Write a protein that binds this DNA or RNA. Structure first.
Ligand SMILES: [Mg+2]
Ligand SMILES: [Zn+2]
Ligand SMILES: [Zn+2]
Ligand SMILES: [Zn+2]
Lengths: 159, 141, 102, 114, 49, 196, 133, 84, 43, 559, 65, 263
RNA sequence: AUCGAGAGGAUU
C-alpha cells in the first residue's frame, strides 16, 4: 500500500508500506497481536467494529463503507448527506437498520409508520396500545391533506 | 438418404461440429488483410458440419444487416422494435376486420437484405422505406 | 458560542492563511479600500451560505444518496448496488468480510 | 392536430404588417426591421448585398425559430445616412442585378439547340 | 402468406405459447448449502407418458 | 428508428430548400447526428449505408447477411470505380446560405423503420373530468380524460423543495377534498349534519 | 498615441504544431544577446520560414465598434505586411535585471523577453503588433 | 407563554421559505383587490407587485418562528434582513 | 406475426442467462428486454 | 400508499418530448392543444379586466381564452355553450378560468423522479406541434434524451402555489445542485462537440459571419470587437466572439498537462474578464463540472445571469457549427495498414503468450501464488494477459488516429464516448464475461461443440480476436452474445433493487429538517445533528478550495 | 403497392417509369444496373425509388369483388 | 451586357447545365431556394369521390393525383383561388378534371393520367394538360383494376407553391457546385493518405485552372462562377423555371420596396 | 362501469 507522509524536512513524501489483506474476520483476536498497529488496523465489517471499538467508531466505519461504495464508481456526494444517513442509523443506541425491524418501529406516531411497510398491524396494535399521534411529520399531514410543517410550512404568518 | 441428421442438445454433447464446410476440412498446403481472423482447422474427428452459422439467429435478428459487426444489446433492441415496425402485415387486410392495423403507403424491400429475409418472406412484405439519411451535425435538433 | 467557535474552525484555517500579513501585501498587493471590501464581501457572502430553517434535509439526503446508486451497473470485494443493500440491512451474513492489517 | 397550416408561411394573418421597423437602443443610428412571412431565401440576400455598400457599419439577420416565418434585420450606418435608404439603395441594387441576369440568360438560351 | 399455427376463439386469433419445464425422469445431483444438514441430493421427477 | 436499436423520434422538418444538399443536387430524407455513433458502437448502421449506396448504384442487392467475406475495403473499392470517395463522404452545401461545408458528411441510402408509438396518441391533458366511485379521486388511463398520478415518489421531490402549499393543493383542491363534521367529545364522524 | 517598441528579429524555428492555419515561431533579436521572442503567426496569411528576418513593432493607437475599413481614404499605421491586435496578461520576472511580457491576440500568443521595455510595454488593455518584410 | 423582544438567536435574515411565502401570502391579498401600499410604477402582476412592496419593507405581516420545544419568536417584515 | 408463433415461456439458479447449450435452438439475441427478460425465448 | 401518499390529480398533462435549441433554459414548449385545456383561476381585479374581459370574448377555442366564468353566487358559467357566452360583464371579484399563456409557472417532471431536480418550474412558451419542447441543456436533471420518453406538467391554482414554484422550484435556482456542490445542468451534444471546434486556434471567422453571430446573442451591446487579425485580412478568432457570450468579471484559471502560460498544446484554460485569453473550450470548462464556468457565473453574477448564459453559449455555438458541419463515416473507424499489422502482431504475441503459460501450467511448473488455487492463479494469469493485449492494441490505434477524425474528435471534446469505444470499434474487442468469469463450460469440458474437450486457450474461452469493423466470427458472436446478455439482465432487476433501496432511504429520513435553532431533527424532536453537516452550511454554496497551510516544506512555509 | 409518382428525396416523377422498367429486364434481357440508367435515373435517390419498389398491387387484385 | 453572366453548355427540354459568372454567392443561392420552392404551379388539390372499388383506398388515390404533373405554362395568368372573388372554385381560378375508368376485361386494366379529362372552360389558355414524357404516351400510373371495379373522381386543380406542398414544386433536382479545387478552402478534406488520390476530380475541373504547388493561399479572393444545372418535372419547361425564378425572387424583393413606400 | 390477466413504452 502507497502512503503519503511527512519528511522531517517538511514536505509530504511517498513512503510505501506493506499491508496485509484478509479473508474473513475476528477483530477481537487480531488486533491483540504482536508487531501490528492496534490503533490503525481496519476491517470492512462495520458490525464487528461496532462490537469492539463501540458505537462512535461504528459510525465512522459504516460511513467509510457507504462512501467507498459511491466513490468506487467515480461518483461524489457531499459528505453532509451520507453523514446524515449514517448519523441517523447511529443515534438510537446501536445500529438501527433501514428496514421495518429497524427504524420503522421506533416510537413515532402511527399514521407515519402506516405509510411504510406493515400497514395494518401498525394500525392494529396502535389502536390497542392506544397511541396518541403527534402530527408533526410530513406523512401525517399528507394523509389529512394539510400544509405539512415543511419549509414554506415551518412557521405561521400573523398580521 | 442420410445426408442430414436431427441432433438435440443432449445428444449434441458427444459430437464435434465443423463451421465452414469448405475452408475447414480440405488440405493444409497470400492473405487479404481486410478478412477477419478465422481461427483454424485444429480438429480431425469431425462428425457433423453445421449448415450455416447464420442460423443460430431466430426470425427477428435474421433481419439485421450484419449483426456480426455489432454488439449484443442493440441486436436484441432491434429485435424488440422490428416487432413494432409497420407495413404490409397481411395481404387480405382489406377483407379482415381486426381492431387496429397499420399499413405503409409505399413499403420497400430494404437495399441490404439478409439471406433469411428470403424465407421470412420479408422482401415481399417489408416494413420500412429505404430513406436517404445524413449523419452530420446540423441546425440544432 | 462554544459550538459557533468550533463550527467555523475549518473555514478559518483557510481565511487566516489567505489573509496573512506577508501574503496580502506581497503576493496580491491589496490596498486599504480593497481590503475593507474584501472583508465586507466575505462576511456577507459567507452569511449567505448558512442552511435555511425550513429546509427538509431528510428527503434531501435520501435522494442525494439514491440517484448515483441508480447509476451502477457492471480485485474481489462486494461492491456496487449489492454492497449498498448489504450495508443498509446491517447485514450479519456479509459475502466479503476482511481485515486489513497494519 | 396542433399543426399550423402551411399557408401560414407566405400569407399574412391579421393586424400583421409585412414590415415592422424599430430603433435600436444599444447603438446610435441603428435599426432592426422585422420581416413577416420571409426567411433566408430573402434575408441572407438583403444582408450580403447590404455589406457591399461602403457606407454601412453593421448588417445582420436571424431566423429566431424555424416554426415561425419571421426573421429580423439589424443595420447600422454612417452619420446622417438613414438605415431605410441603406435598405432601399440595397434592395434596388439586387433587382438591377437580377434584371440583367434575366436578360443575359435569355440571349444565351436562344442561341443553343434542343 | 398467413402461416397458421394459431386457433380462432370468438373471432380472435389465439396462439399457444411453448411452455418450458424441467425434464421428467432424469437423475440430477444437487450440492446443498452451508447451513443445511443435507450436503447432496439426487432428484427425479417421475411421470408416465 | 433505424434497424440497430438506434431508435428516435422526429424533431424538426425542414423543407427541401433550407436542408443541406450535395453537389449532385440531392436532398436527404432525414438527418441524424454523429453522436448516435460512438457510445452505442453500432457500426453496422453506417456500414449498411455505405454498402447500400453501392446497391442503389450498381443496381444490385446488398448482401448484408452475417458471416461472409465482405469488407469495408471491398465495398470501398467498388464506390471508388463508381464515382465517389471510398468511405461514404460527400461534399455537402448548407441550405440557408449555400456556403460550402467546411466538413464533408456521411450520407447514404439506409433502411429505416417507421415504428408504432404515435405522438398524437399520448398527448393527454386534464382539467377536472370524471371521478372514481370509491375514492372521489380522478380516473386512470388517458382514455377516460384521465388524471396523472402525482407520484408518492414525486411527493418526495416536493418535500425536497420545501414547497408545502403546492403539496396541499395538489392533494385536495383537485384529487380529493371533502368537508366532514366532527364531534368535540367523541372524536369521530357520528355527527348527523341536518344542515340548513 | 505612439510606438512602444521596435526590433529586427532572426527566425530560428518553425513549428507546424498539429496545425494548418497557425504556427508558433521562435525568433531572437539581432544585436542584444539578452533577448528572445516566441510568437503565434497565421502561416496562411503570411508565410514565415527558418532563417528569415522580420521587423517587429507594438504601438497602441494606429473603444467603439470597429468600423469596417473604407481606408484607401484614411491613415493606416502600416508599411507593414501583417498586423494583429491583442491583450497582455502577466509580466514575468526571469530573476535579474530581466523581464518578459505575455500577449494574447484572441488565442494566438506572444512571449517577449528583455529589460529596457520596463517604461514602455504597459499593463495595458491596448497593444497592437506589427510585422513586416 | 412567548419569547422576549430581545434574547433572539434565530437567523435575523429571511429564509427563502419565509420570503417565498411572504410574497405569496400578500400576492394573494393583492390579486383579490385589497389595498396596495406602494406606487405601482408600471407593473400589474400581483406577485410582481408584492416583490416591490417587499423591496420597500412595507408588508405588514409578522413571521412566527416555531422552535422545537414549542416556544416561538416574532419578526415584522421590517426587522428581517433580505439578502439572497 | 411470425415472431410470436415461435415463442417460449418459462415459469417464475441462473435461468436468465443465454447458456452455452442454447446455440442453435434459441436465438442468441431475440429476447424481450426488461420485465421478464431472458426467460422468454424465440427459437 | 396508493390513494393518500399518491393521488391521481387534476390540471396536468403529458406528451412526447423534444429538444428546442432556440428556447431559453427556464422554458417549456407546451403545445397549443394542451394549453388549450388546462386552466388557472384568476380574479377580476382593476389591473386585469382589460386583458381578462377580452379573453372571455376570445372564447374557449382560439388561443388566449377561457372556459368557465365564476360569480358572486359561486355558480358556473360554461363558456363553450351558454346563451350569454359573447356577453358577460366581469363584475369585480369573479374568477375567469383562462388558458395557460406565455410566461407561467409549470411544474415539469419525469419518472422515475429521484431528485428535487427531477422536478422543477419552467416558463411556458405555447407552440406548434403536439409535443413538449425543452432546452437541451435541461436534459440532465430530468434525465432522458429524445428517443421517446414522455414528461408531466402540473399547472398550479393558488397565487402562492405559483410563487412557491417560481421562487423555490424554478429552474435556474437548480443549476448548482446540493447533491454534489457543483452544477447539474451543463451544455452538451453538438454545442460542446462544436464549442471545441469554434475555439481551436486554427478557427478564424471573417466579417460576414461575425456580424450575424454577434447579432445572434440577445444581450450584445452593439460594439464589434476589434479583430485579432487586422493584417492582409480582417479576421477574428473563434474564441474572440464566443467571448461575447461570457459576461464581465468572470475569471477562470486551469492548467492541465503541458500548461505553461503559453500552452503549446492550447492545453488548460485562462479566462480574464468577459474575454478568453488562451485555451481550448470543452467539457472541463463548460461541462456541469466543479471548477468550470457555470459553477462560477452562477455564484458570481446570479442564477438568472447564469441561466441566460446557457442559451447564449448555445445560440452562437450551434450557429457557427451549422455552417461548419460534423459527422461520422465508417472512415472514422478505419486504421492504417501498417498499424492494422502492428495490432495483429500485438495480438499474436499475447495469444502465443497464453499458449506458453498454459504449456507451462500443464507440466506442473506453475507456482501457486499464496492463497489461491493452482487453477485460480492461471485464470488470473490469462485474463490479465489478454485484457492487456486489447488495451495495448486499442491505444496502438488511438496513436494511429489523425486529428480530423470525427470520433477521436467527439472524445476530444468529451461529447460522447471514451477510449474503449474506439479500442473495440477499430482494433480489438477483448474478453467476454459472465459472473466475472471468462466463458463457461456448458457442454461437458468444452464451450461449443465446434471444439475439442479440455481446450483452455482464449479463442475457446471467449476472446473476440477481431474488431467490429472487421466482423466477429460465429463463435465469437455467440460468446459476446452470452456477454451483453448479462447487461440486459441487470438493468431489468438491478433497477428494482435500486427502486426499493430508495423507497426505504426516503421513508427513513423524511422529516429530518433543519429547525430554526440550526439543530437537525425529526418529528419527535430528537437531535440527529446539533449543526447541519457539522457546520450549518447549505451544500449548494460550497466549493473545493485548497488549504495550502497543509502542504509545502517547513522551509517553504516560512518563506 | 402501386409504384410512386415522384421520389420522396429528389422529385423526378417516377410514375411513368415502372412499366418501362419491367419490360427492359425480361424482354431484351438486361441487368437491373444498366436497365435503370436507360431511363434517365442517375441520382441514386431516384434510382432506388424503382429498384426497391415492391409491387403488391398485383396481389391485392387477386381478391375477388 | 453588364454583369451577372450566364452561359449554357448543354441544355435539353429538362436540363440546362450552365456556368454563372460574376455573382454574389448569396443570390446564386437565394435563386435556387426561391426556385425549388417559390415559383407557382397548378396541381390537383381537391378530389370529389363518387364510387371507388379499387384495392387502394380513397385518400390514397387522391394523394396520388396530387403529384401527377399538370401543364403550368400559361399559369401566371391563372388566379389564386384564395383571391378570386368566387365561392370555392371557378374556371377563373381552377381547372376541374374528370377521371372515370372501369374494370373491363380479364387482363388487368390500368389507369394512366392519360385517362384524365379536362372539363372547365380553359378560355383557351394553356393549363391542366396532364404532362406525358412517357414514350408509349401514358401519363404516370394512377392505379390498377381487375374485372369489376369502377372509380369516379373530380379533381380541381388550383394554383399553389412548393412552400405549401412539394406537389406544387416544378423543379426537382438542381446541381450546384462552386470552386472545384478548393482554391477558396471553404472545405477541409477528410483523408488517409493523398487528399488528391482519394477524392474525385469533379466534371468541373476543366473550367478552372489547377493551383500549382508554389503559389501561397489566395486570401482576399471570393466566390465567382457557379456550376449549375436545372432539371424540370416539366409542368413548366426548363428555360422558364430559371426564368420564373429570377423573376419571382425579384418580385418578392420588390414587394419590400413597395412595403417601405406605404409606411 | 367494476374486478382479473396479458402485450408495450421510458431509465442504454
Ligand atoms: Mg428516453
Ligand atoms: Zn360524539
Ligand atoms: Zn431521386
Ligand atoms: Zn374562383
Amino acid at each position: 500500500y502507497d502512503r503519503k507522509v511527512p519528511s522531517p524536512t517538511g514536505e509530504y513524501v511517498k513512503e510505501p508500506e506493506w499491508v496485509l489483506e484478509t479473508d474473513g474476520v475476528n477483530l477481537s483476536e487480531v488486533m491483540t497481536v504482536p508487531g501490528i498497529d492496534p490503533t490503525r488496523i481496519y476491517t470492512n465489517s462495520f458490525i464487528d467494529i461496532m462490537e469492539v471499538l463501540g458505537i462512535e467508531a461504528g459510525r465512522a466505519a459504516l460511513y467509510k463503507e457507504v462512501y467507498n461504495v459511491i466513490a468506487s464508481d467515480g461518483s461524489y456526494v457531499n459528505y453532509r448527506h451520507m453523514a446524515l444517513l449514517v448519523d441517523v442509523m447511529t443515534t438510537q443506541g446501536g445500529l438501527t437498520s433501514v428496514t421495518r425491524h429497524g427504524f420503522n418501529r421506533s416510537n413515532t406516531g402511527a399514521l407515519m409508520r402506516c405509510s411504510f411497510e406493515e400497514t395494518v398491524e401498525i394500525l392494529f396494535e396502535a389502536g390497542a396500545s392506544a397511541e396518541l399521534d403527534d402530527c408533526r411529520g410530513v406523512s401525517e399531514n399528507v394523509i389529512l391533506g394539510q400544509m405539512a410543517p415543511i419549509g414554506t410550512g415551518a412557521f405561521d404568518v400573523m398580521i | 438418404e442420410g445426408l442430414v441428421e436431427y441432433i438435440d442438445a443432449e445428444e449434441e454433447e458427444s459430437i464435434l461440429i465443423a463451421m465452414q464446410p469448405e475452408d475447414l476440412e480440405p488440405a493444409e498446403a497470400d492473405v487479404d488483410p481486410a478478412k477477419r481472423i478465422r481461427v483454424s482447422h485444429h480438429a480431425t474427428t469431425f462428425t457433423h458440419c453445421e449448415i450455416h452459422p447464420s442460423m443460430i439467429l431466430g426470425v427477428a435478428a435474421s433481419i439485421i444487416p450484419f449483426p456480426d459487426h455489432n454488439q449484443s444489446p442493440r441486436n436484441t433492441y432491434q429485435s424488440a422494435m422490428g416487432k413494432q415496425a409497420m407495413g404490409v402485415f397481411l395481404t387480405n387486410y382489406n377483407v379482415r376486420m381486426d381492431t387496429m392495423a397499420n399499413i405503409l403507403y409505399y413499403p420497400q424491400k430494404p437495399l441490404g437484405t439478409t439471406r433469411a429475409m428470403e424465407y421470412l418472406k420479408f422482401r415481399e412484405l417489408p416494413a420500412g422505406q429505404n430513406a436517404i439519411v445524413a449523419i452530420a451535425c446540423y441546425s440544432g435538433y | 458560542q462554544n459550538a459557533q467557535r468550533d463550527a467555523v474552525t475549518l473555514f478559518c484555517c483557510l481565511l487566516r492563511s489567505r489573509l496573512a500579513t506577508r501574503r496580502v501585501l506581497q503576493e496580491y498587493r491589496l490596498t486599504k479600500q480593497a481590503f475593507d471590501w474584501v472583508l465586507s464581501n466575505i462576511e456577507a457572502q459567507f452569511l449567505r451560505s448558512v442552511v435555511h430553517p425550513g429546509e427538509m434535509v431528510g428527503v434531501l439526503a435520501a435522494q442525494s444518496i439514491g440517484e448515483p446508486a441508480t447509476q451502477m451497473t457492471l480485485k474481489k470485494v462486494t461492491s456496487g448496488v449489492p454492497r449498498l443493500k448489504e450495508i443498509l440491512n446491517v447485514a450479519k451474513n456479509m459475502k466479503t468480510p476482511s481485515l486489513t492489517v497494519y | 392536430m396542433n399543426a399550423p397550416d402551411r399557408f401560414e408561411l407566405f400569407l399574412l394573418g391579421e393586424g400583421e404588417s409585412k414590415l415592422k421597423i424599430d430603433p435600436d437602443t444599444k447603438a446610435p443610428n441603428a435599426v432592426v426591421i422585422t420581416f413577416e412571412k420571409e426567411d433566408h431565401t430573402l434575408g441572407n440576400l438583403i444582408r450580403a448585398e447590404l455589406l457591399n455598400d461602403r457606407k454601412v457599419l453593421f448588417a445582420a439577420y436571424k431566423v429566431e425559430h424555424p416554426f415561425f416565418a419571421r426573421f429580423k434585420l439589424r443595420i447600422q450606418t454612417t452619420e446622417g445616412y438613414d438605415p431605410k435608404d441603406a435598405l432601399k439603395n440595397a434592395c434596388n441594387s439586387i433587382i438591377n442585378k437580377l434584371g440583367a441576369l434575366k436578360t443575359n440568360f435569355e440571349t444565351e438560351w436562344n442561341l443553343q439547340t434542343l | 402468406f398467413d402461416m397458421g399455427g394459431y386457433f380462432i376463439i370468438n373471432g380472435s386469433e389465439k396462439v399457444l405459447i411453448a411452455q418450458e419445464r424441467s425434464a421428467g425422469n432424469i437423475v440430477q445431483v444437487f450440492k446443498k448449502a452451508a447451513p443445511s444438514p443435507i450436503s447432496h441430493v439426487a432428484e427425479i421427477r417421475s411421470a408416465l407418458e | 428508428a433505424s434497424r440497430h436499436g438506434q431508435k428516435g423520434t422526429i424533431g424538426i422538418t425542414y423543407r427541401r430548400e433550407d436542408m443541406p444538399f450535395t453537389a449532385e443536387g440531392i436532398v436527404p430524407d432525414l438527418i441524424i447526428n454523429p453522436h448516435a455513433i460512438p457510445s452505442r458502437m453500432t457500426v453496422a448502421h453506417l456500414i449498411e449505408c455505405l454498402l447500400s449506396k453501392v446497391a442503389a448504384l450498381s443496381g444490385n442487392e446488398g448482401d448484408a447477411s452475417p458471416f461472409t467475406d465482405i469488407t469495408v475495403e471491398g465495398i470501398s473499392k467498388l464506390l471508388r470505380e463508381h464515382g465517389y470517395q471510398s468511405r461514404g463522404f460527400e461534399v455537402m452545401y448548407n441550405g440557408h446560405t449555400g456556403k460550402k461545408l467546411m466538413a464533408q458528411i456521411f450520407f447514404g441510402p439506409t433502411y429505416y423503420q417507421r415504428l408504432r408509438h404515435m405522438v398524437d396518441d399520448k398527448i393527454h391533458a386534464r382539467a377536472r373530468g370524471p371521478m372514481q366511485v370509491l375514492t372521489r379521486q380522478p380516473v386512470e388511463g388517458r382514455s377516460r380524460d384521465g388524471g396523472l398520478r402525482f407520484g408518492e415518489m414525486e411527493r418526495d421531490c416536493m418535500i425536497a423543495h420545501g414547497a408545502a402549499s403546492f403539496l396541499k393543493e395538489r392533494l385536495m383542491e383537485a384529487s380529493d377534498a371533502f368537508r366532514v363534521h366532527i364531534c368535540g367529545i367523541c372524536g369521530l364522524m357520528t355527527v348527523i349534519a341536518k344542515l340548513n | 498615441s505612439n510606438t512602444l517598441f521596435d526590433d529586427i528579429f532572426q527566425v530560428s524555428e518553425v513549428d507546424p504544431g498539429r496545425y494548418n492555419k497557425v504556427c508558433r515561431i521562435e525568433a531572437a533579436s539581432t544585436t542584444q544577446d539578452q533577448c528572445k521572442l516566441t510568437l503565434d503567426i497565421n502561416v496562411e496569411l503570411f508565410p514565415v520560414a527558418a532563417q528569415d528576418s522580420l521587423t517587429v513593432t507594438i504601438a497602441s493607437s494606429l473603444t467603439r465598434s470597429w468600423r469596417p475599413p473604407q481606408a484607401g481614404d484614411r491613415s493606416l499605421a502600416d508599411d507593414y505586411d501583417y498586423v494583429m491586435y491583442g491583450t497582455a496578461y502577466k509580466f514575468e520576472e526571469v530573476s535579474k535585471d530581466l523581464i518578459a511580457v505575455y500577449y494574447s491576440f484572441g488565442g494566438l500568443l506572444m512571449r517577449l523577453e528583455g529589460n529596457y521595455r520596463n517604461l514602455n510595454n504597459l499593463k495595458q488593455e491596448n497593444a497592437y503588433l506589427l510585422i513586416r518584410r | 407563554k412567548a419569547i422576549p423582544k430581545d434574547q433572539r438567536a434565530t437567523t435575523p435574515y429571511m429564509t427563502k421559505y419565509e420570503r417565498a411565502r411572504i410574497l405569496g401570502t400578500r400576492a394573494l391579498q393583492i390579486s383579490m383587490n385589497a389595498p396596495v401600499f406602494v406606487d405601482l410604477e408600471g407593473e400589474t402582476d400581483p406577485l410582481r407587485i408584492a416583490m416591490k412592496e417587499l423591496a420597500e419593507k412595507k408588508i405588514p405581516l409578522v413571521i412566527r418562528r416555531y422552535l422545537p420545544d414549542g416556544s416561538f419568536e416574532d419578526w415584522s417584515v421590517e426587522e428581517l434582513i433580505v439578502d439572497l | 406475426t411470425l415472431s410470436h408463433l415461435r415463442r417460449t415461456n418459462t415459469p417464475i439458479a441462473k435461468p436468465r442467462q443465454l447458456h452455452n447449450t442454447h446455440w442453435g435452438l434459441v436465438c442468441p439475441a431475440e429476447t424481450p428486454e426488461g420485465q421478464a427478460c431472458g426467460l422468454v425465448k424465440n427459437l | 400508499r396508493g390513494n393518500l401518499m399518491g393521488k391521481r390529480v387534476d390540471f396536468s398533462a403529458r406528451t412526447v418530448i423534444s429538444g428546442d435549441p432556440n428556447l431559453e433554459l427556464d422554458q417549456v414548449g407546451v403545445p397549443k392543444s394542451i394549453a388549450k385545456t388546462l386552466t388557472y383561476p384568476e380574479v377580476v381585479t382593476p389591473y386585469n379586466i382589460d386583458r381578462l374581459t377580452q379573453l372571455v370574448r376570445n372564447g374557449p377555442n382560439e388561443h388566449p381564452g377561457a372556459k368557465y366564468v365564476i360569480r358572486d353566487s359561486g355558480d358556473r358559467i360554461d363558456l363553450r355553450y351558454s346563451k350569454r357566452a359573447g356577453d358577460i360583464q366581469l363584475q369585480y371579484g369573479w374568477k375567469v378560468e383562462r388558458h395557460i399563456m406565455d410566461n407561467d409557472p409549470v411544474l415539469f417532471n419525469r419518472q422515475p423522479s429521484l431528485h428535487k431536480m427531477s422536478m422543477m418550474a419552467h416558463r411556458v412558451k405555447v407552440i406548434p406541434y403536439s409535443t413538449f419542447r425543452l432546452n437541451l441543456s435541461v436534459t440532465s436533471p430530468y434525465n432522458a434524451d429524445f428517443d421517446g420518453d414522455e414528461m408531466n406538467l402540473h399547472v398550479p391554482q393558488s397565487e402562492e402555489t405559483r410563487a412557491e414554484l417560481s421562487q423555490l422550484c424554478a429552474v435556474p435556482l437548480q443549476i448548482v445542485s446540493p447533491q454534489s456542490n457543483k452544477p447539474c445542468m451543463g451544455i452538451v451534444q453538438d454545442t460542446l462537440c462544436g464549442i471545441r471546434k469554434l475555439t481551436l486556434r486554427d478557427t478564424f471567422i471573417e466579417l460576414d459571419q461575425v456580424l450575424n453571430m454577434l447579432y445572434w446573442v440577445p444581450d450584445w451591446d452593439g460594439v464589434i470587437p476589434t479583430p485579432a487579425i487586422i493584417k492582409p485580412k480582417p479576421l477574428w478568432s473563434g474564441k474572440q466572439i464566443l467571448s461575447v457570450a461570457i459576461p464581465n468579471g468572470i475569471h477562470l484559471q486551469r492548467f492541465d498537462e503541458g500548461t505553461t502560460l503559453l500552452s503549446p498544446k492550447d492545453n488548460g484554460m485562462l479566462i480574464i474578464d468577459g474575454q478568453i485569453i488562451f485555451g481550448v473550450v470543452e467539457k472541463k470548462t463548460v461541462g456541469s463540472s466543479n471548477g468550470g464556468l457555470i459553477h462560477v457565473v452562477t455564484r458570481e453574477k446570479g442564477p438568472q445571469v447564469c441561466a441566460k448564459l446557457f442559451g447564449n453559449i448555445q445560440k452562437v455555438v450551434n450557429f457557427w457549427l451549422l455552417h461548419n458541419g460534423f459527422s461520422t463515416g465508417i472512415g472514422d473507424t478505419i486504421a492504417d495498414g501498417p498499424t492494422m499489422r502492428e495490432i495483429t502482431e500485438t495480438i499474436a504475441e499475447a495469444k502465443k503468450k497464453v499458449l506458453d503459460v498454459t504449456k507451462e501450467a500443464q507440466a506442473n511448473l506453475l507456482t501457486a501464488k499464496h492463497g489461491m488455487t493452482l487453477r485460480e492463479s492461471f485464470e488470473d494469469n490469462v485474463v490479465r494477459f489478454l485484457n492487456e493485449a486489447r488495451d495495448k492494441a486499442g491505444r496502438l490505434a488511438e496513436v494511429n488516429l489523425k486529428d480530423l477524425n470525427n470520433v477521436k474528435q467527439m472524445v476530444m471534446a468529451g461529447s460522447k464516448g471514451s477510449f474503449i469505444n474506439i479500442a473495440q470499434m477499430s482494433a480489438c474487442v477483448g474478453q467476454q464475461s459472465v459472473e466475472g468469469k471468462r466463458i463457461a463450460f456448458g457442454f461437458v469440458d468444452r464451450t461449443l461443440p465446434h471444439f475439442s474437450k479440455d481446450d483452455y486457450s482464449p479463442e475457446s474461452k471467449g476472446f473476440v480476436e477481431n474488431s467490429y469493423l472487421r466482423g466477429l466470427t460465429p463463435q465469437e458472436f455467440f460468446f459476446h452474445a452470452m456477454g451483453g446478455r448479462e447487461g440486459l439482465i441487470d438493468t431489468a432487476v438491478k433497477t428494482a433493487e435500486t427502486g426499493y433501496i430508495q423507497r426505504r432511504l426516503v421513508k427513513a429520513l423524511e422529516d429530518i429538517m433543519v429547525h430554526y435553532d440550526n439543530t437537525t431533527r425529526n418529528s419527535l424532536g430528537n437531535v440527529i445533528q446539533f449543526i447541519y453537516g457539522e457546520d450549518g452550511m447549505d451544500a449548494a454554496h460550497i466549493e473545493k478550495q485548497s488549504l495550502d497551510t497543509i502542504g509545502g516544506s517547513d522551509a517553504a512555509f516560512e518563506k | 403497392m402501386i409504384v410512386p409518382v415522384r421520389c420522396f428525396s429528389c422529385g423526378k416523377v417516377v410514375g411513368d417509369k415502372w412499366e418501362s422498367y419491367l419490360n427492359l429486364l425480361q424482354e431484351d434481357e438486361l441487368d437491373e444496373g444498366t436497365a435503370l440508367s436507360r431511363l434517365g435515373l442517375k441520382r441514386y435517390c431516384c434510382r432506388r425509388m424503382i429498384l426497391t419498389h415492391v409491387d403488391l398491387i398485383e396481389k391485392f387484385l387477386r381478391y375477388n369483388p | 451586357e453588364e454583369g451577372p453572366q450566364v452561359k449554357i453548355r448543354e441544355a435539353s427540354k429538362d436540363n440546362v447545365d450552365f456556368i454563372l459568372s460574376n455573382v454574389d454567392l448569396a443570390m446564386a443561392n437565394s435563386l435556387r431556394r426561391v426556385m425549388i420552392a417559390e415559383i407557382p404551379t397548378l396541381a390537383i388539390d381537391s378530389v370529389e369521390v363518387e364510387t371507388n372499388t379499387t384495392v387502394l383506398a380513397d385518400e390514397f388515390i387522391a394523394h396520388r393525383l396530387g403529384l401527377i404533373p399538370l401543364q403550368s405554362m400559361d399559369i401566371e395568368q391563372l388566379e389564386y383561388s384564395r383571391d378570386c372573388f368566387c365561392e370555392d372554385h371557378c374556371d377563373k381560378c381552377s381547372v376541374v378534371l374528370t377521371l372515370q375508368a372501369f374494370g373491363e376485361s380479364e387482363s388487368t386494366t390500368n389507369v394512366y393520367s392519360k385517362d384524365l379529362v379536362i372539363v372547365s372552360n380553359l378560355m383557351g389558355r394553356n393549363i391542366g394538360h396532364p404532362i406525358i414524357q412517357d414514350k408509349e404516351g401514358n401519363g404516370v400510373l394512377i392505379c390498377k383494376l381487375r374485372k369489376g371495379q369502377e372509380l369516379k373522381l373530380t379533381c380541381v386543380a388550383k394554383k399553389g407553391i412548393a412552400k405549401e406542398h412539394a406537389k406544387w414544386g416544378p423543379a426537382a433536382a438542381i446541381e450546384f457546385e462552386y470552386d472545384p479545387w478548393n482554391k477558396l478552402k471553404h472545405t477541409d478534406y477528410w483523408y488517409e493518405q493523398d487528399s488528391a488520390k482519394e477524392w474525385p476530380q469533379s466534371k468541373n475541373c476543366e473550367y478552372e485552372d489547377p493551383p500549382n504547388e508554389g503559389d501561397p493561399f489566395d486570401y482576399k479572393a471570393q466566390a465567382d462562377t457557379f456550376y449549375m444545372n436545372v432539371e424540370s418535372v416539366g409542368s413548366i419547361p426548363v428555360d422558364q423555371v430559371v426564368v420564373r425564378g429570377i423573376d419571382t425572387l425579384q418580385k418578392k424583393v420588390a414587394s419590400i420596396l413597395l412595403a417601405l413606400t406605404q409606411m
